[PDB]
Symmetry: D2
Subunit: 305 residues, 4 copies
């Protein structure tokens, strides 16, 4: 029942984690961002995902953020803690504590960097799936390892399997969905076509942080190729440096988060922010709480490490 409901969510935001000047979490900024997400049709949140810089958190601040999100918003949105890890003990510890504070599901990446065998992946994934509902996250461009079809076709039969957050493209998604494997696209620039032509239930999105109502439009009803085309340049700019560099820069430019980065992330250059401001200005009415888009000066940004 909880499984069945979560499987049908079409718009999940991998929520940005905003920071105070000293690098600690800015919960007022986080809460304002989440409220705007929910008012614009976002049905769930990945807390401390790649976009949310989960890998730059200590576990105690991450479980705090998950707990806080459940307590403030868990009746209004699905709360999916990114509690996966390349260490099985670390994944199990974090995932168990995440469910203990009331998160609805986990996001579970395959072991990045410390790559394992097929047998290792089945052990790791079965163990985390036993803890509660899980989205399985495939992103070989980051992890160094593609989760193979054979693994997915086995673990998809687990009663806590929600689906894939698939980043290897719409052909991969089409093959999975044609065999009854539920998929979210992890790539904003592919998500419209994933949803409308390849059987994806929807998207786990970066760009929704900025324009949640427009990503909602892209995921519901008839294909909207005009909106998809109108968002193309913005979506490319969101990944001109690795995510979440553009997102972090964009939210600062829109007055929605402080210009504070945890290293090793640093902001986009002045020239890239100039290009970005034009793209953000075109959709400013759909950036909730945005009063104006500023290019910003290099000295405004604070690096914490």
């Amino acid at each position: 029942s909880t499984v069945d409901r979560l499987k049908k969510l079409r718009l999940i935001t991998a929520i940005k984690t905003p920071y105070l000047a000293n690098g600690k979490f800015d919960l007022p900024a986080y809460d304002a961002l989440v409220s705007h997400q929910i008012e614009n049709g976002v049905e769930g949140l990945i807390v401390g995902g790649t976009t949310g810089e989960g890998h730059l958190m200590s576990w105690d601040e991450h479980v705090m953020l998950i707990a806080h999100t459940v307590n403030a918003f868990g009746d209004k949105t699905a709360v999916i803690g990114n509690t996966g890890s390349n260490s099985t003990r670390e994944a199990l510890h974090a995932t168990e504590q995440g469910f203990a504070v009331g998160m609805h599901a986990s996001l579970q990446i395959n072991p990045y960097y410390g790559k394992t065998s097929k047998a290792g992946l089945l052990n790791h994934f079965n163990a985390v799936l036993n803890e509660g509902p899980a989205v399985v996250y495939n992103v070989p461009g980051r992890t160094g390892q593609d989760i193979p079809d054979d693994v997915v076709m086995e673990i998809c039969q687990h009663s806590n399997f929600l689906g894939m957050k698939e980043c290897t493209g719409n052909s991969r998604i089409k093959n999975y969905t044609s065999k009854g494997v539920n998929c979210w696209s992890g790539n904003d620039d592919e998500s419209h076509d994933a949803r409308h032509s390849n059987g994806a239930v929807g998207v786990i999105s970066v760009t929704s942080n900025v324009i949640p109502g427009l990503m909602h439009k892209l995921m519901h009803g008839s294909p909207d190729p005009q909106l998809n085309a109108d968002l193309k340049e913005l979506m490319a700019w969101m990944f001109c440096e690795p995510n979440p560099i553009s997102l972090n820069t964009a939210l600062a430019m829109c007055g929605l988060a402080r210009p504070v980065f945890r290293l090793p992330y640093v902001p986009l250059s002045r020239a890239q922010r100039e290009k970005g401001a034009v793209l953000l200005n075109k959709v400013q009415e759909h950036i909730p709480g945005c009063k104006s888009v500023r290019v910003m000066e290099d000295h405004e940004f604070i690096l914490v490490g």
Copy 2:
């Protein structure tokens, strides 16, 4: 002086981290392994590198292992703590403490998984290089990101830059070494030619864990293409699943570590162990402390997670 001496080491072992039945470190097995390495010409150790499963350790056990290695062996071998991370604060914290316990240098990977921009890499690497001597570790097959030449040509001018642990091949190494950038090969199957034909000072090795004296032979004196050819099948078998799966299985088969795996690593299959036993038997006299090679049964292996 310390920098100049470390730059000349030809055989460094990325030492395996052996485990007790309960998953904690087996320091008697570790110490026996290290002593065998030293008696066979190994000049340095990476402590808790990829091969040593540093990513599966908590920091307190990792700093303990580094400290233990310095105190027991630091007058007999170079001790290089793998204190890098995809989190800049984590890298700085670990690297500082590692130097405070007397390690001679660090190994510093680029941020894996949470990939950053060129500006981010320069910030991250300059910060860790300021802590003390560092080997810079490029392995895009694991990290999802190649450290580009432009970055290396900038950071190689740092006074604490020891060189690259380069895994993208002998052509990469030849270009770097021809421009005065010191390189160790990170690939055993390429290391002989890296050393003898491409200017590499030597190797940071996995296979040295098993046959340290033979890896020593490959790094010193005349080219030895016969030995290199004789070790080809063994070297391929060492990577038939991702490292350190074969290594961990091999050491158990040879009676040199307990058959205990921290998840997500699991042993090679029975069939793969059969193939391996034949290859290990061919070099048994060069496996220090090995009394016999056993194929082993599946039930003998213990998984901790």
Copy 3:
């Protein structure tokens, strides 16, 4: 407003932290215990207090337990995280995170073991009081240091000061309450008289874990000195070894927690459990969810810590 409401709570339970066989938290047992507390009139919980073995937890499991308690029960009971420490940085880190997950207040002991000066105490307490509402916890029999009156009379003026959890007796409480300092008694065997004759708002209780409805009766309405007298033997048995040894043994005996101890705590002896079973049987109808009281055998107990 939040301060004013919290100051009036009369029955707070220093909730026991139950364990699985492997020593990790048993949240099903914890949640069953808490629900029974709330149905019997308990108005607040100290999470990971002395009784809850907060000092045997890692911070991540402690913040998890606080967060879990807020999310499952925070609309039905006050959640007071025991986030104090003898390390000021540790106290500030834990207390801040505790409030960030929605706890209503903290419990703040003076630095035990690593005892400091009067100036040190004022610095430490002002710092933790700035984080949010706090109960200040004085128990020199455990800490090695009595928080002196002059310190209390200074820090009681902080707008986040809720009161003392005072363990040095009813005379101490009477002096504080006569000068406008809100107090809860930390001693069950003194709590009835603290409440009814010495101006204490009520009790932060151990025995409420076992008989919450009876402790509720002792704290509300008219004096009930007969009930207080009737509970005297049980209350003494609850402290025949240092708390929470008897509590942990009792909840196992009553089938309300597994017989699992984190070291350095170990169960009461067989002979002490025999005496206890008789006392627990007398009040079994007031032990919520208790199906029977067993003496238990020594081999049933599991010690975790190695």
Copy 4:
């Protein structure tokens, strides 16, 4: 043999842990202090004891400090890590890692604050004694619990039992030593008589941090009641606020550590420092490396917390 040697040490210093302005460890100041201790006849160190503010450290910095002390000084002095705790698992974890980095012994307090039964104490102490040589530390004025004689008479038979660090007085010590239980006095103002009239092997000292050569004189050869009398006022001043408040203030006043306190410790008042300067000036030639003795102004002190 190691046990027998350690049992005979007469002067052990509970070494102060000096801090940088930002509150992190000042290892240059620490190393200068330790070298001066060793040159003045100090035979061992308690690292991160009560006096060393072990309870204000994270375990990773504490094991670092132990490891550093072993590596720099372990051939010249006994290194005793204060790895005890009121949590048995925490004590075992820290004590094991401490021995793994080469410390010679542990200091093991009874569980403070979270007081346990007699059966609990025997379990706790047997467990930590099994890890390696241990001094057992009784200080009920801090812990809230006196370790009773029946516990001591049982655990004193353990082959790793070194003796008591006893703080309940010379009568307690005399009774223990008359029954074959080796004792160090934990109270500087009692230590001369403990040593010369009550069978104590010697002292685990605070005041030795300041005047190590004078504490050495009090522990060796004939009674020196004149020196003992001459040090009476200084010894009382060292405890006019709880240790290590006076020590921390004194070392700053003598230019031997920075005026930096980790909370909840704060310096002595101006008036107490005035009294102290007079007492320190009287023994200045016996304060190794001592600059002028300065009273100091209140604004010079830095509180970190």
